[PDB]
Design a protein around this ligand. Structure first.
Ligand SMILES: *[C@@H]1O[C@H](CO)[C@@H](O[C@@H]2O[C@H](CO)[C@@H](O)[C@H](O)[C@H]2NC(C)=O)[C@H](O)[C@H]1NC(C)=O
Ligand SMILES: *[C@@H]1O[C@H](CO)[C@@H](O[C@@H]2O[C@H](CO)[C@@H](O)[C@H](O)[C@H]2NC(C)=O)[C@H](O)[C@H]1NC(C)=O
Ligand SMILES: *[C@@H]1O[C@H](CO)[C@@H](O[C@@H]2O[C@H](CO)[C@@H](O)[C@H](O)[C@H]2NC(C)=O)[C@H](O)[C@H]1NC(C)=O
Ligand SMILES: *[C@@H]1O[C@H](CO)[C@@H](O[C@@H]2O[C@H](CO)[C@@H](O)[C@H](O)[C@H]2NC(C)=O)[C@H](O)[C@H]1NC(C)=O
Ligand SMILES: NC(=[NH2+])NCCC[C@H](N)C(=O)O
Lengths: 464, 471
């Protein structure tokens, strides 16, 4: 039977969530909390509070994933709550601006930190990083198109690599702290900025760093026991990332003072140059391996999202096809890789993250209020675990705070993002809303011929 | 209708020779394209040239020093101790100064040579342990402490004119004692009154460098002629030496350009210090309309800028009634000078100048932030080029970082600049348009890129244009 063959264990889910949550943010820039907090102890407080507020949302997606039990991770939940229109808007904006830009940016940072010991303070060449990024994207696309177990093995290996590197940084900081100095942690909370506009921006920066706890909800139909292995893996992977994020900043503040932290391009590179005499290239190599681990999880999640969106009536049905042996969604992965390679061609794509700062948390909060509305409207659905209504309410308030910040400040880019997200409405009312045997025949014949040729090339049929 | 193939008809049509060859051809073409783009990246990487190695700088290569010669005038009445100095290090860290030159604190009576001891503190400054408290308290805020060890600092002749050997023995013991106690450097002043100057300076520099290599020795002279300054720096070349070399004149700007380029040519672009005196304020030598220009110059020249206390607010010892002009009082607030009450206004004080964004303290704070972080202002290369009649223009550039252009107008007339460069290195050639960081006079706002061909200057104005690495 040609179906999608559920092969994801508990360890694979833990490695997926940890390898998507820990990325380049803990390595190259844990600076926003310190620049808006102006103290060490208040920065550690803001890091712990951001970890708690991300646990509160991860529990809500554990309940949503065990209740609805369909892949897509907000697309399926908005379909189950307010179906049709808003789900298509979310699918359109993630197809158009969110996932190609993030995948291209992760690939570019991988390529930039692969060549950093050759170009220490040098302004590394531009065209050599785009080629390495394209090679990285094409290699991970091939690996995920071959087998699913190959992608889970890659995720396991590079998650172990980044965790071992962060453990090395933590152990060096702890042995220098307890050894003979302990100097910066004597007069903490001095010079602290106890204002609303500073604590709010520090919490915003700390809460962007915990992003990515919803990766396993995109692949829910491929987990062995989804009523057990999804919330157990979420509850395993949350305190690991929280403890690692606190202890890495403690190790950063033990060795470095505030001035050279706030005036460095990457804090971990300065840490490695100051505490490791030789073998200071280990840390940029580890940053490159961390970005290689994150790109694989992003590719798998985006391909499964586009698969489900194709199956639900949007996004024409070639993207729903499955390979007849080696049961992998090949044309979905091909479409995702093509879009990421197209977005690599645009110089200064780091501007483009300012356009979906508003939309991402808007759709997370929309899925949380959909969970609340389904708790009110359908109270007799089979829920294998239901929590209190405390967590969805406090995460609804947290997401309202998360979307209020890019609307007040940085207000021109948010309206551009809303225009980008609303730019798919000519496709919804003129193609999707109208049924078949009323659409133009010359479009249908062309799409059918292209689907048949792509089906013969990729050896892929729809699910039986 | 228009649905796709099922598994059986796909397995029967996608097995013909003609589709199999297409799939294998596309697979091999994809893999050779992947290897081709990897080879292109490897070829492009090994043809990007190189970048040179940093120069491993000392702590006095990274910003300005600050001389506090009289201690009781720096605070005021009663609180002129070494204990009261501990409460000023947050003001000193507002300036971002990297070192501090504490004046002579030891017991000197007068010309009696056998009674003065350089190891034991005069009790009018404190005792031995609050000096230690001060050293640790300054070490926490990243400020180094240099100790002045001039023997006869109460008296007209500064080096005990009768004997020469025993005072050299005094300084030789004092260097060791205070280096073990933990100071980060020394300063000896008035070395033109010391016979056999170049011999004792080499010995003291040896002892100080032999303890550690992050130690410093500063020498001061009242000379202004280049040949004596060069004569003291033949065997010694790691020595910072402060002099009256730039305090002569500069009524015309090409004269100051000649002085700076002649010094840097005559010493071979070694590390130097830039100041106007060995102990005196900038308002001992310049009118008040040139202080911003000289403060822009002293921060963007390749060396260590050295200032006395009160140079950052523009303190004048002749702006008020009677007073020793060798040691005026610092004007912290408006009750800093108790005598002749009401004579100090608000824009003459530290407190009243911190709010005005067009004050002199604000220019000092912006310039000393840019000096301690930009790599082309930390160890960049200096190059001056010719300009109009009465200008002084130069550029500082390191490798591939942001480059700085400084244009200064030492003239009482309007100038259009006309930067006739034409001789710069290819790594630092001038663009057509450059940004702005600041100006000394109001009328402009910064960040707006200005074109460098109709560049016009109002009198006594300096600019801090900036531009990135390109071709
Ligand atoms: C100290 O400087 C002198 C010359 O400026 C160098 O050699 C020393 O010369 C003195 C003579 O006054 C001898 O007492 C020393 O033994 C010499 N040092 C030696 C031989 O190493 C030298 O550049 C400096 N000396 C040191 C040890 O750094
Ligand atoms: C440095 O200061 C001295 C004293 O203020 C200046 O005058 C010298 O004084 C000593 C002792 O009285 C004499 O031996 C010298 O002959 C004096 N020099 C001259 C030129 O008269 C000295 O001129 C000052 N140096 C400079 C460069 O101004
Ligand atoms: C100032 O710098 C210039 C150029 O770096 C040098 O002047 C040269 O001096 C040598 C030796 O006297 C002459 O052979 C050259 O012809 C001079 N250059 C030119 C362009 O004429 C020197 O380094 C410095 N000048 C002096 C007088 O030392
Ligand atoms: C502090 O401010 C006062 C008033 O703004 C300045 O006094 C002026 O000085 C200029 C020239 O010195 C005169 O032309 C004005 O007539 C003065 N105005 C008044 C109201 O006294 C004073 O110069 C400022 N101090 C400094 C150091 O700039
Ligand atoms: N869906 C995501 N935003 N994933 C990545 C989030 C950022 C990640 N925590 C990092 O530090 O790189």
């Amino acid at each position: 039977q040609v179906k999608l063959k559920k092969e994801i264990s508990l360890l694979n889910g833990v490695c997926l969530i940890v390898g998507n949550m820990i990325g380049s943010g803990i390595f190259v820039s844990p600076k926003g909390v310190l620049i808006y907090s102006a103290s060490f102890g208040l920065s550690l407080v803001i890091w712990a509070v951001g970890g708690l507020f991300s646990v509160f949302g991860a529990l809500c997606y554990a309940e949503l994933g065990t209740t609805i039990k369909k892949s897509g991770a907000s697309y399926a939940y908005i379909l189950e709550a307010f179906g049709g229109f808003l789900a298509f808007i979310r699918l359109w904006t993630s197809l158009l601006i969110i996932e190609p830009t993030s995948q291209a940016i992760i690939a570019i940072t991988f390529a930039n930190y692969m060549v950093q010991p050759l170009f220490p303070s040098c302004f590394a060449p531009y065209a050599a990083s785009r080629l390495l990024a394209a090679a990285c994207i094409c290699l991970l696309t091939f690996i995920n198109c071959a087998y699913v177990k190959w992608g889970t093995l890659v995720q396991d290996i590079f998650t172990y690599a980044k965790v071992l590197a962060l453990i090395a940084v933590i152990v060096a900081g702890i042995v220098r702290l307890g050894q003979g100095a302990s100097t910066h942690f004597e007069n903490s909370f001095e010079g602290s900025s106890f204002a609303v506009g500073d604590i709010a921006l520090a919490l915003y920066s700390a809460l962007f760093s915990y992003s990515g706890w919803d990766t396993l909800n995109y692949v829910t139909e491929e987990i062995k026991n989804p009523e057990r292995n999804l919330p157990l893996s979420i509850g395993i992977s949350m305190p690991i990332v929280t403890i690692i994020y606190i202890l890495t900043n403690v190790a950063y503040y033990t060795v470095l003072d505030m001035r050279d932290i706030l005036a460095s391009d990457a804090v971990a590179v300065t840490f490695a140059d100051q505490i490791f005499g030789i073998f200071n290239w280990i840390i940029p190599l580890s940053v490159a391996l961390s970005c290689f681990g994150g790109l694989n999880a992003s590719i798998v999640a985006a391909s499964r999202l586009f698969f489900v969106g194709s199956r639900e009536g949007h996004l024409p049905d070639a993207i729903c096809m499955i390979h007849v042996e080696r049961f992998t969604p090949v044309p979905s992965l091909l479409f995702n890789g093509i879009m990421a390679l197209i977005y690599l061609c645009v110089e200064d794509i780091f501007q483009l993250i300012n356009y979906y700062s508003f939309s991402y948390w808007f759709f997370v909060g929309l899925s949380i209020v959909g969970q609340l509305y389904l708790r009110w409207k359908e109270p007799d659905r089979p829920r294998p675990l239901k929590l209190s209504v405390f967590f969805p309410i406090v995460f609804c308030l947290c997401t309202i705070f998360l979307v209020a910040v890019p609307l007040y400040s940085d207000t021109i880019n948010s309206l551009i993002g809303i225009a980008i997200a609303l730019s798919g409405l000519p496709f919804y009312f003129l193609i999707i809303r109208v049924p078949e045997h009323k659409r133009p025949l010359y479009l249908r014949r062309i799409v059918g011929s292209a689907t048949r040729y792509l089906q013969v090339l990729c050896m892929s049929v729809a699910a039986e | 209708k228009f649905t796709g193939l099922s598994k059986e008809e796909l397995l029967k049509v996608a097995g013909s020779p003609g589709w199999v060859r297409t799939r294998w051809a596309l697979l091999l073409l994809f893999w050779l394209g992947w290897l081709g783009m990897l080879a292109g990246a490897v070829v492009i990487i090994v043809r990007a040239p190189r970048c040179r190695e940093l120069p491993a700088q000392k702590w006095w290569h990274t910003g300005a020093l600050y001389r506090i010669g009289d201690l009781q005038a720096f605070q005021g009445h009663g609180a002129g101790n070494l204990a009261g100095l501990k409460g000023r290090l947050d003001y000193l860290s507002s300036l971002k100064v990297k070192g501090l030159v504490l004046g002579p604190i030891h017991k000197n009576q007068k010309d009696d040579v056998a009674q003065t001891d350089l190891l034991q503190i005069d009790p009018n400054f404190g005792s031995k342990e609050d000096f230690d408290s001060l050293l640790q308290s300054a070490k926490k805020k990243s400020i180094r402490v240099i100790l002045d060890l001039t023997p006869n600092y109460r008296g007209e002749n500064s080096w005990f004119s009768t004997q020469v050997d025993t005072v050299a023995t005094k300084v030789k013991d004092a260097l060791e004692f205070w280096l073990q106690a933990g100071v980060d450097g020394f300063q000896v002043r008035d070395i033109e009154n010391l016979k056999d100057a170049s011999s004792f300076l080499a010995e003291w520099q040896n002892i100080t460098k032999g303890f550690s290599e992050d130690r410093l020795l500063i020498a001061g002279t009242n000379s202004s002629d280049l040949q004596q300054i060069l004569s003291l720096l033949e065997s010694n070349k790691d020595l910072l030496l402060t002099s009256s070399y730039l305090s002569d004149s500069g009524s015309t700007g090409e004269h100051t350009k000649s002085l700076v380029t002649q010094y840097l040519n005559a010493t071979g672009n070694r590390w130097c210090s830039w100041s106007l005196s060995q102990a005196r304020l900038l308002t001992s030598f310049l009118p008040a309309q040139l202080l911003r220009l000289y403060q822009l110059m002293l921060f963007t020249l390749p060396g260590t800028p050295v200032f006395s206390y009160g140079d950052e607010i523009g303190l004048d010892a002749a702006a008020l009634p009677g007073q020793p002009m060798e040691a005026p009082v610092m004007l912290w607030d408006e009750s800093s000078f108790p005598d002749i009450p009401g004579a100090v206004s608000a824009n003459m004080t530290v407190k009243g100048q911190s709010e005005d964004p067009g004050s002199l303290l604000s220019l000092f704070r912006r310039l000393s932030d840019q000096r301690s972080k930009e790599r082309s202002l930390l160890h960049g290369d200096f190059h001056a080029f010719s300009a109009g009649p009465g200008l002084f223009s130069y550029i500082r550039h390191w490798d591939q970082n942001e480059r700085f252009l400084v244009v200064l107008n030492f003239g009482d007339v309007g100038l259009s600049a006309g930067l006739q460069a034409s001789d710069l290195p290819a790594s630092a050639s001038l663009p057509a348009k450059a940004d702005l960081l600041l100006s000394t006079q109001p009328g402009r706002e910064e960040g707006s890129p200005l074109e460098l061909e109709r560049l016009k200057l109002e009198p006594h104005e300096g600019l801090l244009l900036r531009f990135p690495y390109a071709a």
